[PDB]
Every structure is written in C-alpha cells, then in structure tokens.
Amino acid sequence: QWQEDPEPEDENVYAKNPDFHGYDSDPVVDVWNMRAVFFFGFSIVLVFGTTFVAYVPDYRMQEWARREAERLVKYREVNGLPIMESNYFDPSKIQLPED
Amino acid sequence: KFYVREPVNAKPNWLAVGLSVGASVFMWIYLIQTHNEDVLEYKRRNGL
Amino acid sequence: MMNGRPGHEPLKFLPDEARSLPPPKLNDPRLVYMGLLGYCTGLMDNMLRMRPVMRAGLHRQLLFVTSFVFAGYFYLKRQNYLYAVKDHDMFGYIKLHPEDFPEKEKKTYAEILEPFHPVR
Amino acid sequence: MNPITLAIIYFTIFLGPVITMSSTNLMLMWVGLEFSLLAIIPMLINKKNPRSTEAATKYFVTQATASMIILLAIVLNYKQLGTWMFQQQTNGLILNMTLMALSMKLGLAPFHFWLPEVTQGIPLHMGLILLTWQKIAPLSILIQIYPLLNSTIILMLAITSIFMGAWGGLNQTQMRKIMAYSSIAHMGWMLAILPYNPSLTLLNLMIYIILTAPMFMALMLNNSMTINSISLLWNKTPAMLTMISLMLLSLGGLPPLTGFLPKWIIITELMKNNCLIMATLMAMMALLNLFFYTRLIYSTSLTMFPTNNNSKMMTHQTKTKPNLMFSTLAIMSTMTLPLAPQLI
Amino acid sequence: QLLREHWVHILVPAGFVFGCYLDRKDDEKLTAFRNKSMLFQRELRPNEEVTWK
Amino acid sequence: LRYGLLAAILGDKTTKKLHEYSRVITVDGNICSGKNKLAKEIAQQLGMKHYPEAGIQYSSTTTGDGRPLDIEFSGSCSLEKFYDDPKSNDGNSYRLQSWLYASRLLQYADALEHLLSTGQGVVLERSIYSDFVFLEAMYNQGYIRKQCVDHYNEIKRLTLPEYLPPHAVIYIDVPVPEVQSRIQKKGDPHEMKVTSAYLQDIENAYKKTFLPKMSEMCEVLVYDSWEAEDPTKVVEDIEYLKYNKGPWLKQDDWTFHYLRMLVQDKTEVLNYTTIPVYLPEITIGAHQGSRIYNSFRELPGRKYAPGYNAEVGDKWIWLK
Amino acid sequence: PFLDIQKKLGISLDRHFMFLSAEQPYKNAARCHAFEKEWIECAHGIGGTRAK
Amino acid sequence: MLKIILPSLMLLPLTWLSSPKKTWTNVTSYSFLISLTSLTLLWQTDENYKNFSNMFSSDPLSTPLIILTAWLLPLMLMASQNHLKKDNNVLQKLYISMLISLQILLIMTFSATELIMFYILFEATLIPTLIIITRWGNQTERLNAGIYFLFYTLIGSIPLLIALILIQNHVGTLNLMILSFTTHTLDASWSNNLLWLACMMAFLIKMPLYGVHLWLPKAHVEAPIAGSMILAAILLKLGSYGMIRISIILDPLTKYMAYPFILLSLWGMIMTSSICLRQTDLKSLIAYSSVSHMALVIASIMIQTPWSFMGATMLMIAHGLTSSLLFCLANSNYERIHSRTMIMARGLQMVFPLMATWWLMASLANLALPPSINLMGELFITMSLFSWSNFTIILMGINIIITGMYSMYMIITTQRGKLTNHMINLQPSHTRELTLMALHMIPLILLTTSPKLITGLTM
Amino acid sequence: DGPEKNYEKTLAILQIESEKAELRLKEQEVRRLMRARGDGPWYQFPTPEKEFIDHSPKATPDN
Ligand SMILES: Nc1ncnc2c1ncn2[C@@H]1O[C@H](COP(=O)(O)OP(=O)(O)OP(=O)(O)O)[C@@H](O)[C@H]1O
C-alpha cells in the first residue's frame, strides 16, 4: 500500500459546546458570528432596504403617468377632442414617396 | 531556534538598503521636478 | 507604419514635439495601477522565497513601486505622443484629400422610409 | 566552461541578432544569423550525451540549409537589381524562398519537426534562448520586408503551425515539448498578421517571451521536465502554483489575462481586411492549445498528486533560485490587460 | 493604541468613500450639456452658477 | 557574497587550498567493527574533521535548530522496526534504505562543500559508495521486492557519477560470529535479533563488489581488528600513500567550481531522489503529505526562510 | 532597418556599399551607374508604392 | 457603481489581513453591507436609465441581477463554512477571494455599456468557477466537469468575439445605447444568419439549450455548494441578459432564425422535466429542473414581446433564488450522509420539522404557485407563447404537470415516509443553515409583495 | 440630485461615443487610402539612400 491516512470518522459537534450554532469550534466565535449575521442581514438589510424601496417615489414614472393621463383625458374630453388619436405623429411633417 | 547553520540573511545588507532607498528618493525627486518642467513647458509652448 | 513619417527621429523616445503635449497627472489610475503591480511583485517575490509578506522587504517593495511608476510615466508619455501623432496625420490627410472624405449631408426620419417588421 | 569562453560565446549570441537589426545589407544580416547558429551549438552540446549530440546535429543541419537558401535569395536579388536589399519589383519566388527558409529557421509548421526534438535534447536554459532570442532576428527579416510577402503562404503556414502545435501539445507528457509546440503556435499567430501591422507581431513576441521565460524558470527551480515532476510542486515549492496557473492561462489566451490581447487585436486587424474564416479557425484551435495547459494545471495546482518520502529533505533545506525577475515578468504578464492601449 | 486587530474595519468604508469621490469626479468630467439640453434649458436662478454639479 | 563565477574569477579558486591531507577518506565495515573509534582518531591525528554515520536524522541536525524531529518529518522509517519486523507489508525497509541513501548523499555533499571551500580534509564512514550493501542483503532475503532494487539503482545511477569518489577507503573486516557476539555485548534488544546470513551477505557484498571497483579508482587499506585498534598505525599508513589512479588527478579549478556549485545547492543534489516513480513503499499520498507539510511549517524555526523568523528572535526583518 | 543605430550615430558600417553607384575603391564606374543613380534620385522622398 | 465595486475589492484585503478567527465574520457582515449599498441604483424615479460613465450603466434589467449578485455572496460564504472548516486558513481565504472575484466580475458584466467589456468579464467568470469546482469538489468527476463547463462556453464564445469585432468594424462603437438608436435592418442573407448564430450560440450554451446542457448537471453535481449556487443563480442568467442586449441589432432575422431554438427549448424542457421525474441524484434533479426553466426564458427572449421579456426577468430572479435554496437544502443533508442519492434518506420531517417547511416553500416556489414571482413569469411567458401560437400551451401544460410531480415526489421521498432509523448522524440543525433558507425565502416574499421592480425593460 | 444630471450626462456620453465611432471609421478609410497609394506619412516603405552615391569624376566619362 501507498501510505495514506485513513478516513476521519463522523464528527459530532454538540458533545462539545451543545450551544453550537454552525460557524466555528470556539463558542465565542459562533456567538459573534451568528449575532453578526442576524443583525447585519435581517435588522439593517431586510428592514431598511424594504423601507428605502417602499419610499422610493414614482418608480419608473408611474404616479406621474397616471396624473398626466387624468389631466389629459380631462382636457381632451372637455375640448371635444378625439381622445388618443390613431397616429402618434401628424402628417403635417411627414413626407411619403410617390408610387 | 538559534541556527546551527548561520544563514546569509542574518544581518541586513545595509549597502543594498541605502542604494534602494536613495534610488527611490532620486526617482521620486527627478519625477516631481520633471513633471513641473513639463507642465511649465506645455504652458509655455501652448500659451495661456 | 508611422516609421516612415517625415522627420521621424530614429530611436528617440521623446522628441521635442512631445513636450508640447500635456503630461500626465502623476495621479493617473494607470500609474497607481503600475504601483500596485510593483507592490504585488514584491509580495510575490517574498511569497516565492518563503519570506513574510507585507513585513519583510519594505526597501525592495518601495523600489518596485518606484521603478514601475518611474517607467510608466515616460512610457505613457511616449504613447500619448504617438496617439497625438496619429490624430495629427489623420486630420492632415482628410484636410488634404476632401474629395475622398466628402461633406456628407444626411437626411431625417420623415423623408426616409425604413421598413416595418412586425413581431405578432 | 571557463569564463573567457562564456564571454566570447554569449557576446556572439547577443551580436548575431544585433548585427541582424542594425544592418541594411542582407549579407551582414545572414552573418548575424550564422553567429546565432555557430555560438548556440557549444551550449547545446555542453552536457555531452547522445541526446545533446542529436539535438545539436539536427539544429545545425536544419539551419545550414535555411541559411544557404537565404543566401541564394540574396544573390538572386543582387543579380536581378544590383543591390543588397529586397526592394519592391523583386521576384516572388525569391521572396517566397526567403520566407520558407525563415520559417525553417523559426520552427513553423510544416518545418516544425525539429524544434520539439531539439528542445527535449537540451536543458531548460538553451530552451529559453532557443525559443525566445533566436526567434528575434529571423522575425526581423520578415518585419523589414512585410509589404513584399505573398499573403497566402504566410497564412497557410500560420494555420498549419496553429493546428499542428495544438495537436502536438495535446499529447505531450514532456514539458520541454509543450513549450516547443507553444512556440510553434505563437509564431503562427505572429506570422499570420506580419503583413498586417507588424507592430502586433512584436507585441505577441514580447508577450510570448515574458510568459515563457518565467515558465522555464519554474521548471528550472526543481528541474521539472515532466507532468509527474511538476506535479510534485505542492510539496517542494508550493508558493509558485498561483503564478504558474495564471501564466498557463495567459499562454492559452483567456480574457482577463494579457495573453488574450495579442489574439484579440490580431483578430481585429484581420477582420479589418476581410480575413475572417482564417481567424475563426485560428481562434477555434487556440482552445485546443488551452486544453493541455488546463490539464497540466489540474495536475499541478488543483488535484495534488501523490508525493514521495524523500521529498521531505527538500523541505528541510532552503532555496535561493528565484532570480527576482520571475516575479516581475509573471506579474507583468497575467495582470497588464487594462494597460493594453499603451501596448497595442 | 495596543494590538490593533480592528483597524481592518476601515478598508471597506474607505473604499465606499473613495468610490463616491470617483463618481463625483466622473460627473465633474461630464459637465457638458449641463444646461443645454432641449428639455430643461432653464435660465439660471439669481443665485445659481451651476444647475446640478 | 554567495559563491559563484564572480568569486572564482576574483580568486577564490580551489587548488590553492589543497596542501597534503585534503582528502576524502571513508572507513567501512560491518555492523560493529570499530569504525567511529577509528575515524575519530584519524581525524584528530591528520587534521581532518569527523563526519559521523548518516542516520535517519542528518538533515534535521544540519538544518534549523539542529534537533531530532518527529519521525514523520525525518522520514517515516524506523530501524528498530526493521530488526523486529523485516518483512512488513508496510515498506519500512526500503523507505529506510532510500532515506539513508539520500542522507549519505547530502552528507557527502556537505563534506565536499567543506573540503573545496577550505581545503580541510574529511573523514566519512560508510558513504554512498557502500550503501548498496544493505540493499543487496535485504534483497537476498525476502525483505525487499525487486522493483525497489530498480528504484535504488536508478537513483544511484543518476546521483553517483556527478561526485568524485574518495581517495582511499578503509574496510576493516571482522568475521560474522565476532561481530554477532559484539552486537550481543552492545546493549540493544533490536540489533540483537538480527540474523547471521544478513551479516554474511553484507560481508559478501563488500568484499566482492565494493572492494575491487573501488580499487579501480581508490587506495584500499584492508585491516583487521588487531590492526584496526591502534589507529596511529592506520594513520601512519595513510600518511605515505601515492594518491594516483583516480579521477581526482584530471581536475581543474573549473571542474572543482562546477562541482562546488552543484554541491552548494542541496535541491539540485537531492532532485533525482524525489522522482515520481510510484512505488507503494515510497509514496505517501496527498492527504498525509499535506498534513505533514503543514505541521512542519507550523514548527519553531520553520514556516519561513531561516533569518525571517521573528518568533525565534530574528531581527531587522523589515530590512533584509 | 529594424534598429537604425547607424543613422542614430551617423556612422556607415554597411550602408555605403549598398548598390553599384557607391564608392568603388578607385573611381571606376560600375555599369548602369547612371541608370541606378537616376532611379534612386527619382525614388527619394517618395517611399515604395508611389515610386514603383 | 464604482461605490459598489471598490468596496468589493476592499473585501479581499479584509480577508487576507484579518485574523484566522475573525475573517468569516468581518467579510460576511461587510458583504451584507455591499448588498445594502447596492440598493441606491433602485432609485429610478424616471423613464431614463442610469448612466454613471462611459463604462458603467444600469437599467431595470441590470439592477435586479446586480442586487442578487451582491446578495448571494454572504449566503455562499455562510453555506461554505461547514466544509473547508478543517481546511488551512490560506485555503479558506483563497475560496473567499474566488467568491469575491465572482461578485466583482458579475457586477461589472451586468453594468457594462459595451459588449467587449461584457465579453472579457463573461469569460473571466470561468476561472473562479473552475477553481472552485476542481480544488474543492469532493469527487473525481470534477475534472471532466470543469473541462465540459469551460469548453462549451469557449466554443460558443469565440464566434461571439468574431461577431462583436465585425460589428465594431462596421458601426464603430459597440456601445449599447448607440446600437439601440442606430440599428440598420439586415439584408437577410446567410452572411447575417451566421452572424445571428455567432452572437446567440454563446449565450444559448450557457442558459442552456437542451441540445447542449451536459455541462450543467456534471458541474452542479460536483461543485461543492457555492459554485452550484452561482451556476444556478446568475451564470445561467448571464446568457439571458446577453440575448436581451444583443437581439436588438438582429432584427428581422429573429422572426425565422428562432423557430429551431424555441422548439428545442420547449420539447427539451418537457424532456428535462420528465428526467427530473426519474433521477437517483438530487443535485442532478435540481439541475435538470433549471434546464427546464431556462428553456422557457430562451423561448421568451426569442419571441421578443414585452410580456415575454418581463416574464423572463421574473423567472430569472425567482429561479435563481429558489434553485440556490434547493441546492442548500440538499447540501444540508449531504453534509451528514455524504451521499447525493435521495432515496437513501427518505423519512425526515421527524428530526427536521422546520427545514421541512423550507423544503415545502422551496418546492412551491418551483412549481407554479400563483402568489409568487415564479408563476407570474411562467404565466406571462405562457400568454406570450399563446399569442405567438395557441398550440404551445399543450406543451406548457405537460410541463406544469410534470413539474408538480417531480417536486412533490422530491418532497415525499426525501421527507415523508418512515425515518431511516439507521442514521444516528442526523444532527439536529444549524442556526446558520436555517438562516440561509430564511434569507433565500424572505426576498421571494418581499418581491412578491412588490413585483414592480422585478420586471424589466418593458414595464 | 435629480433627473437633469442623468439626462445631460447621458447626452455627453452619447456625443463622446458617437465621435469615437466617426473617428474609428475615418481612421479605417484613411489607412486604406494611404496604403493603396503612398500619398501620406504612413506606409511609406523605404527606398535606397541617395547620399551614398558618388558624384565625383570617375575613371571613364560614360560612367
Ligand atoms: N543502509 C542501511 N540500511 C539498513 N540499515 C543500516 C544502513 N546503514 C546503517 N544501518 C544500521 O544502522 C546501524 C549503524 O551501526 P554502525 O555500523 O554505524 O555502528 P557505528 O555507530 O559505526 O559503531 P560500531 O560499528 O562500533 O557499532 C546498524 O545497526 C545498521 O544495521
């Protein structure tokens, strides 16, 4: 045979430090890693990011679009205009060819 | 611990230290003065 | 191709015309990148020779940084000069040969009829 | 070798190409090539074994014929025009014979059969010089006459070099032959573009040298000449695997490393002249050039092989061999792509 | 000032500050069309010198 | 200034250093024959230095603090386990044999580094030219599989011709019962349980192979016990040797130079021993090898090059 | 050339016997001296593609 | 963006200069903070997109991928913490450096303006992945897996370089804003159909198509975990992003050069989900599910409608989260049994009654649960395909059926049943690997609460 | 800051890259013309030196 070490058998953790969390062997490091994870991941990211994202105004110009739509249907139907004509541009400034 | 075979790099080579440091200093000095001279000549040729 | 350019000096790193170009800043991102390359060079030198890292050869590391920056300054100056020369000769040729580079006059999207390609 | 002899021989090696550059007469050009020839053989044959004798004989006998063919081209030009310079309005046969002989000198396919043999027959140094410094004057000839070469065999030879270098390095367990087939492929990339902005040929040359020299040093540090010998490097000197990996992945051109710049910009200037499908073939066989580098770097850096009992003595003792230029050349390769506009 | 095993906490904040400075430098570099776009093009207010910096 | 071509040109040549007793001299013999007691007095009388027999731990002693290391760093081998279990499946035998060949090889290299550097002579004992004896003994018994013999002889083929042989060899002979009783009166439970055919095959190997092929290049001085005692007579024989008939005569300053350079670098010395010939008795696997290498670089004095260890007490580390 | 070290220093190691109309040892004209001189004096300032 | 990728670079010295005992913690916390500061670029109060320089931009297609890439890093980093805990500290730190390099390069990809920047970065991503798969995989097939995963990509990507180079020589800029406003209709010749193929069959390999997917199971099955997270979460989406960017310069050829690929995607989606119905290996089951999902994204991008691009973005992000979650859930058992065979351990929910809820939610994400950004994507691309052709729902429905089947079968034959009483090594749980699943699922719930963000260029 | 910043910065970037495109194509056509005909500074391939001709009186008149 070729002189390798054998397989180290199945470790159990909770024998040593039964308050093990999943991070390290030192009981202090596990605590100050889980506190770090929980705090920095939940309490600031998943909270303040939700707040920031919820209090972003007019995301992609949505509320503005509704307000403009409202005033424009108002104007168009007050002044008897055809609401939302069937051609974006006017032929006043479009040149087609012949034949 | 205290080596049975005394190495080469036990004590420094203070010569190489001084040469390296003086060379770096001379490099930076020539660089800053050359930079000032080039800026001034750029402004002198291209006017202002 | 620019070797046969008239007045081209043979083996002249920085002709006197290049002194009319503006120099670099000395804070350029590429010169600090070269300093970073020198620092990593010293670090790798120490790693290869079974030495401490960020602790051992501070005179060597400083020398690496300075050599890299002090070379990159002049090499970048030369390259700036060469690209300046490129633009210079290109402008001169278009100005001498306008019949080949005519004053084109383009149209608007009202007069041209680009074809429609539905998705459907 | 005593010092007087080394001085003489290395001066001659340095002066061959230097005469070749700073000479307008093609005949002094030939003289420089012959100094490079003559002075190399002593150090090829220094260890005095049958492998070295065979390598030196093959080198000599292949390079002498190429030299005679170049001299024929030169003498035919002198008869035609009464000058010692390949002008325009020379004969394409003269120019093509010159190209053929120069390809035999470099080591390009289908004139490649001698380079891996010779390289295996000689130490790691004398492979470095043979693959880096001897390539510089023969390339200088072509660079000085680039608007006179036929753009057809220049590309067929490049394509053959690409294909054959890739396929040969696919199956070489010996490293001294891997380096040779890499040389063949990179000279192919050079020669393909040489009629098209020969500045890029010198770019690829400098990149190739800067990659190969530290690789040869890596092989020198433990006299590694085989995949199984370079695999015993996670024990002997394991601080080198990072640089070896990045250098191999630069050689087989991958983007974030500067060894992709020459292929990329070559493809650019070749697509600027409607040389499209040739560049496609070249770019698609560079992948096979990359495959055996990947196999190698598996074997040495990612899947650590079995070692021996006697390799612990190497761990007891200490080393001095890294010349402090391995670091600079390995880091200026593999990390200089963002400075590529200053390289071009 | 003993046993600074905690100075490394300045590297990432330093990176953030430096990145914000560089973005500031870039939008200083691109101060063209600053009030020349056909959409806004406002005349400067009585105490105004630049419109968005 | 590390030695090199520059030093040789400046004038640190070698032939200026040799005076008369600038001699590689090896004393050989069987397991207990009086080698150290004789070599020590030769070195005292003539002005050489004694280089004791290279065991499992010569690299450790000539490296670092110069202590013994745990047996998994200084090999994986035990001599006791060879005497009490010579036909193991665990290949302790050839592992030990090859480790000891490498240790004798480094020993000879250190010796030649000292000789050519200083001109001072060197007394060895049982050098790399006499290590095959124990291999042949093991292989005549069933203590080795033949592939290990090919491995050993290949490494020998690669390593031996690069070095110069000794000037003289001093093989002191003892019959097998005499050495066996001497072992009995030595005080070792493990050497006591060794056979007589092993010793007789050592003796046969010596007398048949090692003596004539070295008489083709060296001055042999075969003595016996009654002659091996009183080293002064052996010394007085060494003093009047005509050191002809060898390759030392055809050596220039530059041959000495390149030998001195090959010998100044122990990695080039031991490279051809670390070859990847994959015998199960010599291979140690990646997991175990990595564990050993890490645990070795986590020792005092190791983890960095010699001068660059502040945990020991080195200094000016930020300025080397 | 590749490295114009001669033009750098003004020397002429080889660039003065490049053709026939070039300093024969005693002033003996080579044949086609006039023709080569005239060709060369036409092809000066110009380079290559236009001189051809 | 610079304020996002400079701190990401500073995370590397933070690794190398910290203590061995205070390196996972610092880098994890600071990675969470990078993720936090990667929300400034969701401040889009307007229709015009966010250009910070000639280099960097950020559209509503870039930003979710950016945020997800910055957000995965802490999760990869904590999942990678049980294995390679007994590894030497330098080896740990090398793993960390590779993951951070992935983060940086992928952000640079999704933020890039030019296509060549995107190319060199899309290919630089190969080196960390290959190193992770090969040096830290547990089995011996990792080498062939790395070779496959590298060379499929390179084979596809060399033509991409050639086509980009052509486009530069033809137009001059290769920037995406200018190629948008200056795109000439194509003459519909073979010389342009080859261009279409060269531009597309690098991304289609990476997504992947069903004709070419053999790299993805071999890699997912053999990468340790974090490689699997990335390879399921954003490396596949790195092809969809590229298709959505590059298709604008290929009209009208996409109307007829897309039939083979839509068709391959649809039929091979059915084939892959049928494979998932019958597969001994759990880590392969997740992978074939990823193929069966990304095929819809292929077809959707080929159709090039607003609904379709939209649903593609939704499915991209949703699939990334839930697939990373499922790979974590399988790794949670693999760290104990050390077997990928699923029918080995089949009677959990006794010992792990809380992880068995994360399992359930991960599967319900996988199958079409309506209040979820998975079903929104799947439904909208189904509607796009029905508009395209009414006869595609016949295939999408078969997929829906099989996709309920294999997911519920996974849950049942892994959790439900009788406990394998011969497994004393089923340790209770890790707070770490519970927080993992929580951090994978809480985003899904939030994004379901507000999918206005998770749409793309078209909404 | 506001929308004007983004809008006008985009306009700046657009003029920059448009000008770059213009100049790249211009450089292509320039190199094409200079190489097809040596009217320009580039691609002026070397000719024999003029100053190394001997103009002195020879040994024969009809030199
Ligand atoms: N190459 C080898 N192979 C196997 N065993 C060896 C080898 N070399 C030495 N040994 C063992 O090491 C021991 C060394 O004893 P050695 O012959 O050196 O005695 P000594 O120390 O010289 O003094 P004395 O000869 O008086 O005992 C012996 O028992 C021998 O078997």
UniProtKB/Swiss-Prot annotation, chain A:
<comment type="subunit">
    <text>Complex I is composed of 45 different subunits. Interacts with BCAP31.</text>
</comment>
<keyword id="KW-0249">Electron transport</keyword>
<dbReference type="GO" id="GO:0045271">
    <property type="term" value="C:respiratory chain complex I"/>
</dbReference>
<keyword id="KW-0679">Respiratory chain</keyword>
<feature type="transmembrane region" description="Helical">
    <location>
        <begin position="36"/>
        <end position="56"/>
    </location>
</feature>
<keyword id="KW-0809">Transit peptide</keyword>
<protein>
    <recommendedName>
        <fullName>NADH dehydrogenase [ubiquinone] 1 beta subcomplex subunit 11, mitochondrial</fullName>
    </recommendedName>
</protein>
<dbReference type="GO" id="GO:0042776">
    <property type="term" value="P:proton motive force-driven mitochondrial ATP synthesis"/>
</dbReference>
<dbReference type="GO" id="GO:0005743">
    <property type="term" value="C:mitochondrial inner membrane"/>
</dbReference>
<keyword id="KW-0812">Transmembrane</keyword>
<keyword id="KW-0999">Mitochondrion inner membrane</keyword>
<keyword id="KW-0496">Mitochondrion</keyword>
UniProtKB/Swiss-Prot annotation, chain B:
<dbReference type="GO" id="GO:0042776">
    <property type="term" value="P:proton motive force-driven mitochondrial ATP synthesis"/>
</dbReference>
<keyword id="KW-0812">Transmembrane</keyword>
<dbReference type="GO" id="GO:0005743">
    <property type="term" value="C:mitochondrial inner membrane"/>
</dbReference>
<dbReference type="GO" id="GO:0005739">
    <property type="term" value="C:mitochondrion"/>
</dbReference>
<comment type="subunit">
    <text>Complex I is composed of 45 different subunits.</text>
</comment>
<keyword id="KW-0249">Electron transport</keyword>
<comment type="function">
    <text>Accessory subunit of the mitochondrial membrane respiratory chain NADH dehydrogenase (Complex I), that is believed not to be involved in catalysis. Complex I functions in the transfer of electrons from NADH to the respiratory chain. The immediate electron acceptor for the enzyme is believed to be ubiquinone.</text>
</comment>
<protein>
    <recommendedName>
        <fullName>NADH dehydrogenase [ubiquinone] 1 subunit C1, mitochondrial</fullName>
    </recommendedName>
</protein>
<keyword id="KW-1133">Transmembrane helix</keyword>
<keyword id="KW-0809">Transit peptide</keyword>
<keyword id="KW-0472">Membrane</keyword>
<keyword id="KW-0496">Mitochondrion</keyword>
Swiss-Prot record, chain E:
<keyword id="KW-0812">Transmembrane</keyword>
<dbReference type="Pfam" id="PF08040">
    <property type="entry name" value="NADH_oxidored"/>
</dbReference>
<keyword id="KW-0472">Membrane</keyword>
<feature type="transmembrane region" description="Helical">
    <location>
        <begin position="6"/>
        <end position="22"/>
    </location>
</feature>
<keyword id="KW-0679">Respiratory chain</keyword>
<comment type="subunit">
    <text>Complex I is composed of 45 different subunits.</text>
</comment>
<dbReference type="InterPro" id="IPR012575">
    <property type="entry name" value="NDUB1"/>
</dbReference>
<dbReference type="GO" id="GO:0005743">
    <property type="term" value="C:mitochondrial inner membrane"/>
</dbReference>
<dbReference type="GO" id="GO:0045271">
    <property type="term" value="C:respiratory chain complex I"/>
</dbReference>
<dbReference type="GO" id="GO:0009060">
    <property type="term" value="P:aerobic respiration"/>
</dbReference>
<comment type="similarity">
    <text>Belongs to the complex I NDUFB1 subunit family.</text>
</comment>
<dbReference type="GO" id="GO:0042776">
    <property type="term" value="P:proton motive force-driven mitochondrial ATP synthesis"/>
</dbReference>
Swiss-Prot record, chain F:
<protein>
    <recommendedName>
        <fullName>NADH dehydrogenase [ubiquinone] 1 alpha subcomplex subunit 10, mitochondrial</fullName>
    </recommendedName>
</protein>
<keyword id="KW-0597">Phosphoprotein</keyword>
<feature type="modified residue" description="Phosphoserine; by PINK1">
    <location>
        <position position="215"/>
    </location>
</feature>
<keyword id="KW-0285">Flavoprotein</keyword>
<dbReference type="GO" id="GO:0043209">
    <property type="term" value="C:myelin sheath"/>
</dbReference>
<keyword id="KW-0679">Respiratory chain</keyword>
<keyword id="KW-0274">FAD</keyword>
<dbReference type="InterPro" id="IPR031314">
    <property type="entry name" value="DNK_dom"/>
</dbReference>
<dbReference type="GO" id="GO:0008137">
    <property type="term" value="F:NADH dehydrogenase (ubiquinone) activity"/>
</dbReference>
<dbReference type="GO" id="GO:0005759">
    <property type="term" value="C:mitochondrial matrix"/>
</dbReference>
<keyword id="KW-0496">Mitochondrion</keyword>
<dbReference type="InterPro" id="IPR015828">
    <property type="entry name" value="NDUFA10"/>
</dbReference>
